[PDB]
């Protein structure tokens with residue numbers, strides 16, 4: 001990147017430092033739904049056509065991405081929780097054979113065995129914040145967690161999360177390649193970075209940064225209960241923005 | 255006693271050919287989305303301060319004034335140049351008292367006529383024209399119509415991290431700033447070599463002095479008359495290449511083929527030319543003619559009201575009598591269903607409530623905003639702007655600037671004031687013009 005580009009990107013960074021209002025919510029973007037399949041378009045890498053999980057797997061295979069383990073309950077991004085790639089492939093059952101390392105690729109994984117088409121959903125940690133300098137609500141992506149929609153035979157769909165990816169680590173490598181956002185207009189005009197920045201992803205809230213560290217699953221037995229709770233949280237997040245501004249009030253015309 | 259120390263009152267020279275758009279708020283973008291076009295809906299409310307937007311697009315005569323100014327001074331330089339001429343009466347290098355002064359051109363000394371000019375003078379005059387070997391068409395040489403202008407980045411000189419004093423780069427008292435930490439910044443320069451080739455560079459170097467926020471550019475400014483041919487293969491557009499910028503009938507028509515760099519050069523020349531013609535009361539800080547931002551363009555196009563899809567009050571594209579409200583492509587292969595095939599004379603349709611003409615039609619209009627698919631959400635809502643002074647070695651995809659508005663071929667959609675269109679800063683199309691703008695020196699009441 002040229003220094004001009006670096007300065008531009010530094011200007012295009014959301015600073016949630018002195019925000020008077022923050023709200024951290026976790027989504028469960030299902031890739032098997034339109035408007036979220038952009039992250040699944042190529043289930044298996046096709047030449048220069050790759051989905052997010054394939055790109056991420058290649059990046060970790062080249063020591064170019066710092067991803068952290070999915071710890072049930074919390075998301076500490078520290079050097080302690082950096083994942084071990086060989087352990088990840090072994091513990092999740094990925095057959096790999098080590099090729100010539102050449103300091104480029106740690107382990108040679110066949111594309112047929114890359115679990116790129118089973119990751120059918122993503123945990124997206126997004127942080128709604130109120131900008132202290134111009135009073136504007138904005139969403140800042142914190143991390144994305146690829147969850148492999150695996151099958152446990154007896155346990156059917158397992159949906160075990162793989163790891164946690166800080167968004168600033170993956171942002172440089174997803175801000176370049178172009179993807180098509182719709183199946184009606186197939187123009188590769190925008191990037192996945194634009195998909196995440198414009199919040200074009202559609203997902204149900206599965207957890208909020210609660211004071212008891214409680215997830216929706218704990219106090220919602222059935223999927224419909226989780227659906228209605230997610231709708232409630234969305235309504236309250238929207239109600240915050242609605243109550244901020246008072247140009248829609250007509251109580252004065254009385 | 256705290257009475258106050260006011261300053262001497264200045265004057266506001268309302269620019270010629272421009273109108274005043276009031277400060278206001280508008281919701282950028284189209285709320286309802288056409289699913290057949292694939293695009294989703296991206297809308298963000300904004301607010302913009304009052305500014306002066308040009309009534310019409312820049313016409314061929316108005317840009318020909320620019321190219322003629324560049325021609326005249328280059329010719330004066332050649333006359334003063336000892337190589338071609340050497341008169342030295344066109345280059346004032348010393349003051350009437352005799353002390354050396356900064357060398358400037360003597361614009362009072364007239365350029366000799368083609369007949370009265372001697373061999374040296376005629377050589378200097380002809381050393382900027384191009385005579386076609388076969389057709390004997392004596393025309394201004396396109397690669398010699400170059401404009402050398404300087405832009406000081408007031409914005410970048412004001413960032414906290416771009417402070418000359420290292421101690422002032424961080425107001426946090428807990429953060430100890432390394433005494434010798436290097437802040438690498440880029441500056442765009444351009445210098446004419448001994449051969450005569452324009453050498454543009456982007457100098458990256460540690461922040462040293464104020465000479466690092468000065469961007470110097472030497473841009474060839476002659477319009478790309480071959481856009482008419484290049485943009486439309488298998489078409490009889492050979493005549494507009496030879497007519498549009500040259501024919502006297504095509505003077506009030508909007509100028510085409512002007513790239514983003516050439517538009518910026520034109521606006522800067524307009525700024526300095528205005529300054530040369532207006533006396534400044536002591537301390538006067540006058541703004542500069544600039545290319546409108548995307549947000550300012552969209553605000554002034556829709557007349558401030560967020561209910562307007564078009565620069566006209568209704569949603570229909572046609573009056574109740576059957577007359578179209580803009581110069582676009584109404585039907586399939588029907589560019590001239592509105593009465594005009596190629597761009598039309600400026601001020602040929604009805605203006606806005608603001609008074610802007612051809613605000614969506616004729617030619618698309620260059621904006622000063624760098625293009626980004628997520629651009630509307632990455633820029634602030636106070637006078638929104640996404641500025642990116644691209645580096646000479648940047649990828650060509652990073653040199654896209656927003657071209658907002660519709661042209662004589664944009665279908666109803668691309669003429670909508672909320673539909674973003676882009677084009678590369680390097681190229682100039684036959685359907686893209688521009689409209690220089692300047693911030694209004696306004697102290698008005700509220701609503």
Ligand SMILES: *[C@H]1O[C@H](CO)[C@@H](O[C@@H]2O[C@@H](C)[C@H](O)[C@@H](O)[C@H]2O)[C@H](O)[C@@H]1O[C@H]1O[C@H](C(=O)O)[C@@H](O[C@@H]2O[C@H](CO)[C@@H](O[C@H]3O[C@@H](C)[C@@H](O[C@@H]4O[C@H](CO)[C@H](O)[C@H](O[C@@H]5O[C@H](CO)[C@H](O)[C@H](O)[C@H]5NC(C)=O)[C@H]4NC(C)=O)[C@@H](O)[C@@H]3O)[C@H](O)[C@H]2O)[C@H](O)[C@H]1O
Pocket residue numbers: 323324326327328331355356357358359400401402403446472530
């Ligand atoms: C024509 O255009 C071609 C395309 O750009 C160009 O071709 C290029 O060069 C060729 C060699 C090459 O072949 C080409 O490829 C291409 O690269 C041509 O060369 C030519 O452009 C060139 O000449 C122009 C020209 O002279 O006509 C240049 O434009 C002029 O530049 C001047 C300075 O750069 C401008 O003057 C301003 O700044 C100063 C110098 C002021 O002038 C006087 O300054 C004196 C002191 O030195 C006086 O003090 C007084 O200054 C006052 O100071 C007070 C404060 O005390 C105020 O703040 C103001 O600064 C000023 N007050 C006023 C209003 O006068 C000035 N008075 C006198 C004694 O004249 C001032 O007048 C201007 O602010 C000038 O405006 C501008 O036209 C062009 O830059 C150059 O490229």
Ligand SMILES: *[C@H]1O[C@H](CO)[C@@H](O[C@@H]2O[C@@H](C)[C@H](O)[C@@H](O)[C@H]2O)[C@H](O)[C@@H]1O[C@H]1O[C@H](C(=O)O)[C@@H](O[C@@H]2O[C@H](CO)[C@@H](O[C@H]3O[C@@H](C)[C@@H](O[C@@H]4O[C@H](CO)[C@H](O)[C@H](O[C@@H]5O[C@H](CO)[C@H](O)[C@H](O)[C@H]5NC(C)=O)[C@H]4NC(C)=O)[C@@H](O)[C@@H]3O)[C@H](O)[C@H]2O)[C@H](O)[C@H]1O
Pocket residue numbers: 442443444445446447457463465466468470
């Ligand atoms: C784009 O960039 C191109 C490459 O730089 C350039 O092309 C070059 O010029 C073409 C005309 C030609 O074709 C080729 O030569 C080509 O390579 C283009 O013109 C264009 O340039 C634009 O950007 C440049 C840039 O920044 O890169 C600008 O250059 C700047 O010019 C200034 C004026 O000349 C320079 O300012 C002063 O800087 C100091 C270091 C001076 O050096 C001496 O330092 C000693 C120790 O202090 C002396 O004591 C004395 O100090 C300075 O004294 C002056 C007095 O006025 C200052 O005001 C300060 O008191 C003090 N400076 C400091 C260090 O604080 C200096 N002695 C002298 C010689 O006076 C000296 O170099 C300059 O005066 C600036 O450094 C430089 O970047 C360019 O102007 C612009 O058009």
Ligand SMILES: *[C@H]1O[C@H](CO)[C@@H](O[C@@H]2O[C@@H](C)[C@H](O)[C@@H](O)[C@H]2O)[C@H](O)[C@@H]1O[C@H]1O[C@H](C(=O)O)[C@@H](O[C@@H]2O[C@H](CO)[C@@H](O)[C@H](O)[C@H]2O)[C@H](O)[C@H]1O
Pocket residue numbers: 288289290
């Ligand atoms: C995208 O949606 C717009 C909605 O306005 C469609 O515009 C409609 O169709 C055109 C011909 C006319 O301008 C109007 O009739 C207008 O109302 C547009 O054509 C696009 O339609 C596509 O997507 C639609 C959608 O996603 O809603 C589909 O409609 C329904 O889609 C669901 C998908 O599950 C399907 O189950 C329904 O049977 C279907 O009606 C369109 O089929 C599709 O072309």
Ligand SMILES: *[C@@H]1O[C@H](CO)[C@@H](O)[C@H](O)[C@@H]1O
Pocket residue numbers: 219220221222224225226228
């Ligand atoms: C999900 O919704 C059901 C609806 O009855 C509740 O009973 C449950 O406690 C959870 O909130």
Ligand SMILES: *[C@@H]1O[C@H](CO)[C@@H](O)[C@H](O)[C@@H]1O
Pocket residue numbers: 249250251252253254
């Ligand atoms: C505005 O005034 C009252 C109070 O807000 C509304 O109920 C009414 O609809 C009007 O538009």
Ligand SMILES: [Ca+2]
Pocket residue numbers: 580581582583584589590591592593594595596662663
């Ligand atoms: Ca037309």
